[model samples]
Target: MFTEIMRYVLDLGPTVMLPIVVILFSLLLKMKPGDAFKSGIHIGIGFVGIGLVIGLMLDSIGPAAKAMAEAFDINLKVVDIGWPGSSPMTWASQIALIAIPIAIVVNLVMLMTRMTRVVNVDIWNIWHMTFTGALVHIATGSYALAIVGVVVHAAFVYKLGDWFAKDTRDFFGLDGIAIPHGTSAYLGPIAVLVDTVIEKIPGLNRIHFSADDVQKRFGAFGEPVTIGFVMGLVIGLLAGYEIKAVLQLAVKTAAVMLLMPRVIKPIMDGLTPIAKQARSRLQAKFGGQDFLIGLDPALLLGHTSVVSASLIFIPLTILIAVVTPGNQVLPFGDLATIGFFVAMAVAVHQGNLFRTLISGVIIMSITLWIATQTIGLHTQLAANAGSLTGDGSLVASMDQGGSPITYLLVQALTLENVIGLVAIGALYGIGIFLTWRRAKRFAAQAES
Candidate 1:
């Protein structure tokens, strides 16, 4: 049974990559052998849950969208954009054209400048994993993308772990912290690095709106619920486009676009006032702003500038989601795009709701409107070329308005196209989580 499963996984590269990535994460972070597996599984579960929910929602809404389109006067149809069938670029080309160069550059910079000295390598690792994960997710949806992320994580960490264990003093720049490498290395030194980065960025920075923060304010499941609503909107839009249905898209789109902006925006908008009031209360009780605003984590962490970038992208994503729906047969890809954009917006903004909402709306409205017009013109060109169909596939028969090489190159590098880089971050997160759990468990056992 194990052999058979392995064989099946080999054919389905994504699934196979998942466990491997998780394990790598565990080892590099210095997780215990026993707890690492479990922690990695937990992370994967989160990743998969996000993927599945998004997929199922899109699938259900797609048909309704089709029906609604028929009722309207539009002739748009969502169709397949599969490779070797209708897609312009093959999977290999995608990886080569987009992934390899980015990886090479990142790795080269790290190796050449020794930037690893100042910033934690583990933190940087997560960034790589997240970028790659996003790309894989775009290409193959949940299963395949998730697997790829895991595999890549495992490969890097395993090798790095061995190096650290061989010479702890030199490897970690620590005097006496004896990290046993392999799994132990993840626990001891690596964990510190991971924790430092996490605390500074996601935990304390509040630069990206964290699910945990939302949960703290709203309820136990606030994070998931909020995420769910956003996912629902993404799925609904994709479904509508697939079915060429106006009402279906309109309903779901509105739920996410109109209501979400209001519901989520207000909370985000109110963050400043809430922070200010809390600061005021503390000052009144304690006698000075020195303890309140002066020592605030936001200031200490200094992620405000980074947070601004996130705010800029938020509304830009909404506009993209509102206008672009994934193909009918495979709404997963489209929903993933929505997730990527939203996550980016949230991650970049972190804690500043006002900036998150305002910038998100502004960029999305203006940029996306322009993009939509261009896409519409292209759609017309494709339609006239006799390639337009009710399906959601891109009109390939029509000229792309440039040389084939230039067009292909442009598609290969487009912000929308090169998403695999995020996989590296997801894989890194899994590794960190696993390592943290393992070390914590070992520490607990030692205490007892």
Candidate 2:
């Protein structure tokens, strides 16, 4: 019992802590020095609170959804989608053991190689690294994967920093290079630093805007925490675990959280100089006064959230395809795909919804065709155990090389599938939209 408890604590702790650290770091670096720490704590606390709500919902939702599906003679299998059941726990611990140390080393090597540089390293960076970790966990269902993801991201950021510094003799040029993770996690800090330097430098002050200005304009907490809280809560409830169970999971999550700060510190300390040299070379290569220290207009065309959302969806689809194909009764692919779209839609409001929908249709069509032709969808169809027929029949679609794609599509487009997708999508969509709305309101109020 004690061992199990410890394991939970260690696993879930990091899950909670990492994101807390990232957001805290972002807030702290951008805030006034005197109040930075206090604000970071506030942000961290708020995030943890969101996590708690999420845990509770995840706890309840799983079992409830299963029960409902069973009742209606419907098999709405949602677990096998990506990282379900024990996989998350298993992956998190495994990743912790291998990925964290590797990330540190990579960051160090990049710095030594003059591949990356940073102006300063502090407690605030813990938040950045931790947030990166959260993103990985959420996206890939592997904590170790998250660590590796962040390391790769940091390596890239370090390289970009080096290039920017060398090319422009300033950090602003370095800031222009965006990494894969998205703005809420990466660009938040970079923007803060660039704005700070621009304000301080004589010629650059003309373009300088306070980090506070951006914060106020963009909303204090990226998107409102409520969206994650609500969606997480709904998911928790659907997962069917009790509140106590959820809290227990969270406590375990904290253990992983403690490592982020420790892991990030040494990395930054080691990578400063390589970043500097890279910056110098980049400046020498690009010979223009305006281009020296400012962001390229072309690179800034789309919001980072849009890009990250797409990145996340592609991997999610691949994982779902590889693990649970079309013929399977499990609706994981549908669940994950909807989740991806909803999350992205929430994160990026400026994009044309019609365009997004059209593009999504094209992508899904192509993916479905490939899934049918290449991998076959027998795995997906098999999950229902012959439930696609009106009487919960399990016909063998794979035996005679039946159209696994059609079988799966028929199952996915069934009444239950429609009900589940619509219900879940609406729930998630409203939650996300509300979160965005709240963030926008917060931004409006802050500016006022």
Candidate 3:
């Protein structure tokens, strides 16, 4: 019964699922029925627009990435079946069936205990936790260990959501919200640490560039559309396309850059009312509390640094795939989803495009290596979950394949490496301490 209900809900996709949650959450906060319904509709429309543009981007880039791969004669044995290929395999697993309830219960308990401030309603992404569980189960063949993996993953992600909530809200002008996305949220601490070091470096610290700086310096050419046009042109050329085809690709890329923010406007429009109501309710209940609504990182993709960095990484990822030693995954399908990994890095760098690019390169490089390492296990899990049909082909997603947290945790447990286990524990300890300190700071400010 539980599995069937989860299957039905999962089929609704984020476009429907998110808005339904939004309306329901709004009603829970005592928002007017009509207003909640309208907000939900607007949110749904925004998601559809985002979906269309992203689809357009994937359609344009997927072919180019493949062409670039072929043109470079870079062939790898592992088929990059992409996230779409991996996600179904994840959901079909026994772990996913129980993951949703575990996550929800964990979230509620965390909120009540004040261990986390995020109301994580991005249920669609619970697959991330389930994926980790499934991997651990495959590695150790223990259902108990798998459940432990899921809970631990959830706890860490929620801590990250809390840790970055203030910066995220301030950076994106999104009040009362934080992103708990598995891929991107993990990068926040790394970005913070990197940015802090960069701040002290003499030459690099002096350098500052953002989309606004570009526009001010170059006028129209610095516009996102123009940047996209230039990038697309370059990508096409690199893909060994003719001049005319290059120009067409340029136009489509520009359209993606220019139209994305317009699509995001309606999402924010829908969310603003709900955010305000959430704030009001929280204030009423607790006098003053810095509650953050945990949301998907997809909402942040419209940021200029995110868009620009992601576009830059598509070809760069392909190039890396070619040269990176022992990298089996070709990175075809996940090329379009690079924004999910870099959006928080951009925010953490405070919109410094160069810094974000540097961070993205490092992140992608690590991801590729990790994905390569996990191919055998990923393939095994897919087969066990009944999603594998092809003949002895290895499959992996750069997104899940590159998951640093999952990789380290599973390795620590399975290999019994005390050093690796200590490293993972230290990472989470720092994250929790940072979050606790931030919470206290927020409390002090509120009292003042």
Which number leads on lDDT? 3
lDDT for each residue of candidate 1 in 1-448, tens digit (9 for 90 to 100)? 5445533543433222444554564455455666556544543443344334334334443343333333333323432221112122221222323332343344445434532211111221232233333333443445454345434533343333322322332321221112211112222222333333454565343444544556777885354434444444444454344433434443443333223223222222222332344345533664522110100011101122222222223233333334543311211122222222222222223333443444334323322222232243234433433445687455321111111111222233343433422432343345455444544564466468
- Give RMSD (Å) of candidate 3 vs. truth: 2.7
Model 3 misplacement above 4 A? 322-326, 416-448
**Backbone N/Cα/C clashes per model:** 58, 63, 0
lDDT of 1 at 164: 34
For 289-383, candidate 2 gives per-residue lDDT tens digits of 11211111112212322322332333333334334434233323232222222222312222332323333333333333323431222232322
Pairwise lDDT winner, candidates 2 and 3: 3
Model 2: worst 10 consecutive residues (lDDT sum):
396-405
Of the two candidates 1 and 3, the one with more favorable TM-score, higher being better, is 3
Per residue, candidate 3 scores C-alpha lDDT tens digits across 22-105 of 899889989899999999989889989988988888888667756765676667767566676777888888888799999889
Report the error of model 2 at residue 146, Å.
Answer: 14
**lDDT score, candidate 2:** 0.33
> Once model 1 is optimally superposed onto the true structure by TM-score, how far is the C-alpha of residue 121 displaced, in angstroms?
13
